[PDB]
């Protein structure tokens, strides 16, 4: 784990606090080691804030891994860019191969931020952050499940 505290609170600024709740993966229990990385990037692909990674995941499930772990974001919502883009990659062991891989990411954009729950569909590694060119990981109804938390 390389989360972040929340940063200092600012007069009429908001706070976003993340909550991870799982993810589904029809091979979800068979990953190694799995973990989350959440960054925040531009049109361009690039870093607005540092990156955190969340701790290896508490529970496996077959088709689901389970988190519940919350993520701040490093940075006041309104003062992100127009373009950014929050993304959540997933990441495990390969136990043959000895080594850590990106098997898919998901990502949220700025207008999608706002209370309360939120599923979103998850894409093919290699993670494309400028988000141009997406490849579906399955048509299957196993995604990302998220709550999200706005602060004054």
Do not use: W
């Not at 973990?35 to 995941?57: C, F, M, R």
């Not at 496996?60 to 309104?78: A, C, G, P, R």
């Not at 599923?119 to 093919?124: A, D, H, R, S, T």
Request: proline share 7%; hydrophobic share 35%.
């Amino acid at each position: 784990g390389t989360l972040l505290p929340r940063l200092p609170s600012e007069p009429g600024m908001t706070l976003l606090t993340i909550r991870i709740e799982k993810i589904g993966l029809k091979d979800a229990g068979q990953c190694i080691d799995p973990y989350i990385t959440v960054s925040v990037k531009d049109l361009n692909g690039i870093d607005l804030t540092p990156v955190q990674d969340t701790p290896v995941a508490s529970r496996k499930e077959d088709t689901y891994v389970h988190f519940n772990v919350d993520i701040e974001l490093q940075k006041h919502v309104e003062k992100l860019t127009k373009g950014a883009a929050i993304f959540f990659e997933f990441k495990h062991y390969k136990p043959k191969k000895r080594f850590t891989s990106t098997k898919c990411f998901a990502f949220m954009e700025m207008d999608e931020i706002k209370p309360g729950p939120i599923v979103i569909e998850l894409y093919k590694k290699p993670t494309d952050f400028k988000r141009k060119k997406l490849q579906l990981l399955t048509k299957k109804p196993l995604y990302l499940h998220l709550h999200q938390s706005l602060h004054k």
